[PDB]
Amino acid sequence: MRVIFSEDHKLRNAKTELYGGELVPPFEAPFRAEWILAAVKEAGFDDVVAPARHGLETVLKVHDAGYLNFLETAWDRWKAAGYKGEAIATSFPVRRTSPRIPTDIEGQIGYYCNAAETAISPGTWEAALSSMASAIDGADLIAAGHKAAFSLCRPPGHHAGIDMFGGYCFINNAAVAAQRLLDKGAKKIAILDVDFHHGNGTQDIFYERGDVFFASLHGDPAEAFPHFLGYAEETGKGAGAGTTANYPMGRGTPYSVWGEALTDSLKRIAAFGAEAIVVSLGVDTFEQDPISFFKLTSPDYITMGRTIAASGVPLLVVMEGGYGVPEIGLNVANVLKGVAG
Amino acid sequence: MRVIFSEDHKLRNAKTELYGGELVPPFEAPFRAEWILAAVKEAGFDDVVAPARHGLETVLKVHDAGYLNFLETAWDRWKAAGYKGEAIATSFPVRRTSPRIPTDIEGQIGYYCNAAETAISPGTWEAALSSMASAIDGADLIAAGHKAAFSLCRPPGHHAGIDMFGGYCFINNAAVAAQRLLDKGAKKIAILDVDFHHGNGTQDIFYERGDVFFASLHGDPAEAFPHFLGYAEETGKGAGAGTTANYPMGRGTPYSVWGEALTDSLKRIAAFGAEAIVVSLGVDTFEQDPISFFKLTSPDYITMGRTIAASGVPLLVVMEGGYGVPEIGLNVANVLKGVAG
Ligand SMILES: NCCCCCCC(=O)NO
Ligand SMILES: NCCCCCCC(=O)NO
Ligand SMILES: [K+]
Ligand SMILES: [K+]
Ligand SMILES: [N+]
Ligand SMILES: [N+]
Ligand SMILES: [Zn+2]
Ligand SMILES: [Zn+2]
């Protein structure tokens, strides 16, 4: 299957991440894309193409315009204000705050952020646009008839909500892809988020919408980032009623348990009548992942891809998280092997 | 006039503050208390006493119990979790999040925080309790008939809301003092916050209460910390209808303008019928303050103290912010000279 990948991911090469009270090099760094690309090619997925560029048509249907405007100028404004580090939010509109949007960069960066560990750096916006473009071109391949494609997105997307960045994410690539599929003629689409972390940004975007079903398997938010969404009770509101399905799971979860949640999520998606599934693929579910507490093995990713593809509807696989260890590439490639086999 | 001050402020000696995307030495440093104490003594206010210790009776009436429990153990839990830096929140319950409280330290520190620049460090809880005690003992002096007293609080308090820390603050000393005055028999009290920054914590505590009038003069939150409260439209809710009065002001504001808002706030307090006024005194309104944009001069603080005391009701002055230069002490002492003269 075709792999869509932009070298412009490298424009996001942030120096710092706030982790454990320290400013350290970020987990979500360019070497991840290098490792994943090499592994997918090694596994025989060597039909790699750059995305065409895209403007904001599709993304404006899932993200707020003010938010996108903010991201486009955030770095320039931060630098113009004289700050010496990267652009890191510290004040946030938490409980019982005004809904008003500040005018300055310090206030706006907090207004538009859900998670302060993620610094905005020079090139971040351009990189995010390239990653979005990979998702859009992957979606277009599915819309045009392919049954599988892989968008090697970096930066990742699933923590970016309607109007907030965080969790290493700026533009919700999977949400843009789902929207693209709707725009190309689908009436019903599902996003299945198998990254270790809850896709709170994706959930937010579609929570009141009934055209896109959102399912996520993830570490229990009571004890895992993103901490403030992803409970099983969240099933949707309004037009979105019954089209969010969260499967929080605990420490040490192995495939024998995780796979039961996968089966159930696919039942839900099939009952909803999805015409295609956008898979938000993070491999931070791996037993060696440095920031995560599930215990999937490399062979389990083959099983995972096979099971998702046995839905018998077309798949767009969209890269999310997975850190640290050389096996992030093997693990991604293994999902694709399961899909293609 | 009596000055209440605890040497246990020095138990809060954090190494880091997130400012401009860097971890820098904190502005709210122990040497502040040293500078202020020395200047007030130099001005003739040498009746300095340590507070008696206090338990949680008063403070539980203004802060949430879970919040206080969290502060008590935060440092220990952070350290036990293996993190190498000081305890700094990054994920926050912002727009459209679950209201649930996480169970782990990573989730809880965000749940209970409004502002990530403020690190929890060893000794912080102990220091915050001593600062609260200084406010309580000051309040007790006013309750017993003194017309003025100064509680040299450090850490400051006015950004600590019902259940969140931030802005260098953990326990809202001024709120605790106001509550103490009610408990000792007052029916109506006012808090007048003249620190450059909006007392969003104080506002939060009393927003739905009609027993404590809250007035604040501050940099406009559209372009100043705390960014998400302090607009003039916020006048109260429920039982608190009409008993919050915010006076946001812009860049370069001098006393000729600032003092007009002071006059108005005192008119409102008098119409409310406050039996005493707790003054949240920050001197970060000074023209040299490193993080603030007002242009008060050292002589203006004498005028300020005189005007507030011309209310003819008892005053408890509670220390808040004011940074960078040893003249913070002169400026505080000048307010006290205006009160005492
Ligand atoms: N402070 C911990 C931040 C963790 C962010 C994890 C983001 C991630 O990998 N999402 O898939
Ligand atoms: N990133 C700027 C944080 C500013 C905190 C100021 C808190 C303060 O001085 N309050 O009175
Ligand atoms: K997930
Ligand atoms: K103020
Ligand atoms: N949905
Ligand atoms: N109030
Ligand atoms: Zn993840
Ligand atoms: Zn201040």
Distances (CA, A) of A220 to A49, A253, B102: 37, 11, 10
Judge: A21–B119 Cβ closer than 8 Å, yes or no: yes
Sheet holding A3-4, edge to edge: A48-49, A3-4, A148-151, A315-319, A277-281, A189-193, A212-219, A244-249
- The answer on whether A193 is annotated among ligand-binding residues is no
Fill in the amino acid letter for A123: G
Run of H or E residues at A301:
helix A298-309
**Closest of B157, B177, B176 to residue B167, by C-alpha:** B157
Positive/negative CA dihedral, B53, B159, B16, B64: positive
Backbone angles phi, psi at B77, to 5 degrees: -70, -40
Query: In 3-state terms, what secondary structure has residue A213?
Result: strand
Query: Given B102, B161, B163, which is nearest A221 (Cβ)?
Result: B102
Work out the end-to-end distance of chain B between its first and last CA atoms, rounded to an integer number of angstroms: 11
User: How do A17-19 and A22-24 pair as beta strands?
Assistant: antiparallel
How crowded is residue A38: how many other Cβ atoms within 10 Å of its Cβ? 13
**Ligand 2: distance of its center to the CA of B168 in Å?**
7
- The answer on whether A106 is annotated among ligand-binding residues is yes
* Domains contained in chain B, number: 1
Work out the minimum CA distance from B97 to partner chain A, whole angstroms: 6
Backbone angles phi, psi at B263, to 5 degrees: -55, -45
Work out the minimum CA distance from B91 to partner chain A, whole angstroms: 4
- The answer on whether A86 is annotated among ligand-binding residues is no
List the determination method.
Answer: X-ray
Judge: A18–B18 Cβ closer than 8 Å, yes or no: yes
Tell me the two tokens of residue B61: 């009436």
Work out the end-to-end distance of chain A between its first and last CA atoms, rounded to an integer number of angstroms: 11
How crowded is residue A222: how many other Cβ atoms within 10 Å of its Cβ? 17
Beta carbons of B197 and B217 less than 8 angstroms apart: no
Tell me the two tokens of residue A196: 């270790």
What's the residue count for chain B? 341
* CB contacts, 8 Å: B100 with chain A: 221-222, 228, 231
Run of H or E residues at A237:
none
Distance CA B325, CA A195 (A): 50
Q: How far is CA A193 from the centre of its chain?
A: 8
Q: Is A56 exposed, middle or buried (0-12, 13-18, 19+ CB in 10 A)?
A: middle
Distance CA A337, CA B278 (A): 69
**Ligand 3: distance of its center to the CA of A199 in Å?**
5
Fill in the amino acid letter for B86: E
**Closest of A35, A53, A89 to residue A319, by C-alpha:** A35
Judge: A116–B166 Cβ closer than 8 Å, yes or no: no
**Ligand 4: distance of its center to the CA of B248 in Å?**
9
Note the ligand closest to the C-alpha atom of A258.
3
Distance CA B163, CA A132 (A): 38
Beta carbons of A241 and A235 less than 8 angstroms apart: yes
* Residue B155 in contact with ligand 2 by CB distance below 6 A: no
- Residues near ligand 5 with C-beta < 6 Å? A 206, 209, 212-214, 236, 240, 243-244
Run of H or E residues at A17:
strand A17-19
What's the residue count for chain A? 341
Query: Given A84, A91, A222, which is nearest B228 (Cβ)?
Result: A91
Distance CA A237, CA A271 (A): 18
Judge: B84–A119 Cβ closer than 8 Å, yes or no: no
- For residue B116, give every residue at least 6 positions away whose Cβ sits within 8 Å of its Cβ, in sequence order, or none: A18, A89, A90, A91, A92, A116, B18, B88, B89, B90, B92, B166
**Ligand 7: distance of its center to the CA of A195 in Å?**
5
How crowded is residue A290: how many other Cβ atoms within 10 Å of its Cβ? 10
Q: Which residues pair with A189 in a beta bridge?
A: A212
Work out the minimum CA distance from A240 to partner chain B, whole angstroms: 14
Work out the angle at residue B135's Cα, subtended by the Cα atoms of residues B130 and B138, and round it to the nearest 5 degrees.
125
* Catalytic residue numbers of A, as ranges: 159
* CB contacts, 8 Å: A222 with chain B: 100, 102-104, 107
Work out the angle at residue A152's Cα, subtended by the Cα atoms of residues A149 and A158, and round it to the nearest 5 degrees.
100
Judge: B102–A228 Cβ closer than 8 Å, yes or no: yes
Q: At what angle do helices B327-340 and B298-309 cross, to 10 degrees?
A: 30
Positive/negative CA dihedral, B20, A122, A172, A195: negative
Domain hosting residue B19, numbered range: 1-341
Residue numbers in the known binding site of B for Zn(2+) are 195, 197, 284
Q: Which residues pair with A214 in a beta bridge?
A: A191, A244
For B86, which residue in chain A has the nearest alpha carbon?
A21
Q: Which residues pair with B151 in a beta bridge?
A: B4, B318
Tell me the two tokens of residue A241: 């009623």
Judge: A103–B166 Cβ closer than 8 Å, yes or no: no
Specify the resolution in Å: 1.1
User: How do A48-49 and A189-193 pair as beta strands?
Assistant: unpaired
Q: Which residues of B174-207 are buried (b: 16+ CB within 10 A; e: fewer)?
A: bbbbbbbbbeeebebbbbbbbbbbbbbbbbbbbb
SS3 per residue for chain B: CEEECCHHHHHCCCCCEEECCEEECCCCCCHHHHHHHHHHHHCCCCCEECCCCCCCCCHHHCCCHHHHHHHHHHHHHHHHCCCCCCECCCECCCCCCCCCCCCCHHHHHHHCECECCECECCCHHHHHHHHHHHHHHHHHHHHCCCCEEEECCCCCCCCCECCEEECCECCCHHHHHHHHHHHCCCCCEEEEECCCCCCHHHHHHHCCCCCEEEEEEEECHHHCCCCCCCCCCCCCCHHHCCCEEEEEECCCCCHHHHHHHHHHHHHHHHHHCCCCEEEEECCCCECCCCCCCCCECHHHHHHHHHHHHCCCCCEEEEECCCCCCCHHHHHHHHHHHHHHC
**Ligand 5: distance of its center to the CA of A263 in Å?**
19
Beta carbons of A246 and A160 less than 8 angstroms apart: no
Beta carbons of A199 and A159 less than 8 angstroms apart: yes
Note the ligand closest to the C-alpha atom of B85.
1
Atom of ligand 2 nearest to the CA of B323: 9
Query: In 3-state terms, what secondary structure has residue A114?
Result: coil
Beta carbons of A339 and A310 less than 8 angstroms apart: no
Q: Is B334 exposed, middle or buried (0-12, 13-18, 19+ CB in 10 A)?
A: buried
User: What CATH number did the domain enclosing A258 receive?
Assistant: 3.40.800.20
Beta carbons of B265 and B214 less than 8 angstroms apart: no
Distances (CA, A) of A148 to A182, A259, A284: 17, 21, 22
Query: In 3-state terms, what secondary structure has residue A130?
Result: helix
